[PDB]
DNA sequence: AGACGGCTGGCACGACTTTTGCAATCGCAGCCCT
DNA sequence: AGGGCTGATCGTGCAAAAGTCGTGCCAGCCGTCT
């Protein structure tokens, strides 16, 4: 069925169309990949697809790629336990093994080791089970999700990403409307975050928006799309002031030393 | 302080202990040794129970000193896993042997499970419990018109005013637990 | 850190387990049980 | 033991090589790019091998645990510092005449290389703290994406591996080389896709873009062919969806 | 409620910073700092935790430096059972340490970028990344940081990914330099003189010469508070110093003969 | 002179507890079975 | 004359299925003022 978007911080410009395309793509479980910028709704899109985890039993599995340290990461792929490692314990299967059928959210880190990604890809392509040992991989389907945070065919040229892994990945991409692109509900989602901030503050009432402030908001380079906008929103909210003035100063650059 | 008089003492018969080694019969010595091993295991079991009880009791009295001093109204949310983590108490032997321990303190006589109070929500990093809620609700119903007792909604308002935020559902439920007539049933002609 | 060799106990069940189960009981429950047990042993006081 | 035959005369000769080799258990290589389907052909040989009822199951060379390499082909028997269990042998020990396609051989450790170089020795399976080795006949087969001589000039794999190279590695024709049943392959792939797409049929169809796809990079013979097929189909998903203006450019900026 | 301990923060900007902290105290968001060296920052962080006055312990206190192997701070999100070798049951720790609390980020800049990414991944959603096969689990706790590291500099360096850097942007604090603070410095100097006279319970606070305070000013004073505390005991080290005022402050522990 | 209204307790689900039900293979070497 | 085979000892948990609370939630009911 359909679940209410707990957040729909969406862009009427084309993230409306982007969300529509996502909805159209949603029903199948084939390869799922996205694309976006530093902090550019991409987690929010992950939530979008997780709601689009159709029907029920959407097992949300997160693959925080730059995690897993160095060593046992290999096990985190496949599965620990038996008597294998320096310990012995019950079958904690690999993270992919732990979730059967689940949604496989890729963290778009781009792992340094192509072979480690390839080993995940071989398990990702199909699961034949590990009847020999939990050290191996098993017989599991899963919904899978990818996204982009960098230049894909460049890295293909840059040799950063293996072509075979790339060929299996990105069957259907999902690019994102940047802050330099989406720019749609800037004032709209701006006051949305403002109301959220007031309610969090249990605040009396929104003082408003300054025309100078709105002009700056239009002029903002917005180095971060989604959050950094909300970040500066929080910045001004904490900056705060009398209800007499609707908005005061610019919260775009909190880093700057306080006056 | 552990009730040492209420703490039994297991003594081994030393005359039998001196009357078995000299036994030129192996069967008597073997039976005596087995009995000694069993008795030692039993005495060690009782002593370990006593010692773990003392340690966990120190941990709880530290946790429930506010419950010990101010009372059940100021009874903090106390749990075994939190107490075990706080006092490094047994992870499972404690969960086993925790049954049936009683204490006499300035508050009165309290059970072992009576020391541990449930968990209730409190904003601003504060924390809340169950026995606290019971005593507070008793006071709030006391702080009602003799003709008209405090409503479960009124009790919820009082709890939220205290920062407990019990809400009307738990308020009515705990008033049922407190076993008192609420407003529309405790209503009396003035 | 990684995996290789190295690394290395156990508890007891039944008799030690029964002794431990005796302690989860009540105080006077332990006292009457102790009396009943001491009814047998010729090497205890 | 078959699939959507690429339907190629080259494919015919490659299948001929496979069939000629079919009874033989000689170790075998392959140099196939993604979408080649050489693995599928390899396993097709495995089922169609002389050991039809044989235990034939691969294990990615990239798989092995950093230290468990000995525990990779052999399997734990006694001790090993586990202090318990560790009485299970290796899947490679679990082979015995069966098949484990040496996929991912393009990347295994030079350490892994030499340990296998021992495995290339005839028989003699040694396990941890062992008594007597096991001379366990097992069928060997592999495929790579790159050039064995290229690695050799790099010295990437030891020439011991080249010795390990035993059967003539047939190679999949390139996409530009294959160019065999592109419309037909599209037809079968789209039959399957519409089955998955659950749409009735491709009323649009058309074939001008089929020839346009004949002018395509096709990096993956089946990796991209069907991949782009589904990409375009899903972008369409309509009955009247023809071979016109359907692009394979999921990375590229569409309009 | 609970009152934070006295700190000699006589700088007017320091009072302003305290006030900013006070406003933030009801708030609950990230709290970063410029980490002035020899400057007692996490003491202010404690005053914050103290200002929150949260029930139980929300004032976690652990740095990054000792987390030499990645595994250590990795185990700030600990291990559950049997991942690697289980040396003890429920290797989890330092995470529930502020069960309903906050995190003090010390030596944060030294942390691994992979470690940093893991931390940030924890930040928003809160998922429990426990090593070994299991399910995550959130907790309503916070975090806070204080480091001499220049954040714009590291962003240029890209030492940590920018996502986390912004994710931390909720409260900054540039502590004044030790060479920046002078009047508060002498104030705390007398304060530490008295505090030592108390804790050691020596009969008499000797005092210090005007020359003594002046020369201590002529001292490098790299740490306004950390160096001062060492100097305090350094003069307290001298025997009979308490009876009469002396300018004998032991700078170099290696100084001898 | 029937609806408001809070009672007020029945009903509910998970969330914290919890109680019981669980002992071995050693180790040789002599004795028993074959 | 050779194989089986034997246990004398081998002791602070847990885990597992179950239960049970907290809190909510809901449905009728009575005092009454309409
Ligand atoms: N409507 C919204 N609801 C919730 N969070 C929002 C909303 N709009 C923006 N955000 C915030 O903006 C950010 C979205 O970018 P995110 O997906 O976190 O970055 P990245 O693309 O680097 O993964 C998050 O911090 C998110 O909380
Ligand atoms: N003859 C074929 N019929 C149908 N599909 C094929 C055929 N050959 C290869 N494929 C496809 O190729 C994919 C396997 O990729 P593969 O070519 O094995 O990569 P690599 O050759 O690099 O190992 C499978 O999904 C399979 O559907
Ligand atoms: N008000 C105070 N009371 C006691 N000790 C203090 C106080 N302020 C600072 N310190 C001491 O100064 C030392 C270092 O302080 P600080 O400069 O904040 O550390 P860092 O070098 O990490 O900034 C700490 O060990 C602390 O004990
Ligand atoms: Mg392949
Ligand atoms: Mg410091």
Author numbering:
A (entry chain 4): 1 to 259
B (entry chain M): 286 to 475
C (entry chain M): 1 to 8, 10 to 46
D (entry chain 3): 5 to 259
E (entry chain 5): 2 to 258
Provide the authors' own sentences about this structure as they appear in the paper:
Bacteria use sigma (σ) factors to recruit RNA polymerase (RNAP) to promoter regions of genes that need to be transcribed, with 60% bacteria containing at least one specialized σ factor, σ54, responsible for transcribing many stress response genes. DNA looping enables bEBP hexamers to engage and actively remodel the RNAP-σ54-DNA closed complex to convert it into an open complex.
To understand the structural basis and how DNA is stabilized in these complexes, we determined the structures of PspF1-275-RNAP-σ54-DNA containing mismatches between −11 and −8 [RPi(−11/−8)] and between −10 and −1 [RPi(−10/−1)]. In the RPi(−11/−8), we observe multiple structural conformations, at varying degrees of tilt of PspF1-275 hexamer ring relative to RNAP-σ54 and varying degrees of RNAP clamp opening We also observe significant degrees of promoter DNA bending, demonstrating the wide degree of conformational flexibility in the complex. The DNA density downstream of −10 was generally poorly resolved, indicating that this region was highly flexible. However, one conformation has sufficiently high resolution to allow us to resolve the DNA. This interaction is only possible with the tilted ring conformation, suggesting this interaction contributes to the stabilization of this ring conformation in both RPi(−11/−8) and RPi(−10/−1), giving rise to the higher-resolution reconstruction of these conformations. Significantly, we observe the σ54 N terminus is further shifted along the PspF hexamer in RPi(−11/−8) and RPi(−10/−1) compared to that of RPi(−12/−11). Second, PspF1-275 hexamer ring tilts, as observed in RPi(−11/−8) and RPi(−10/−1) structures, altering interactions between PspF1-275 and DNA, which could contribute to or stabilize DNA melting.
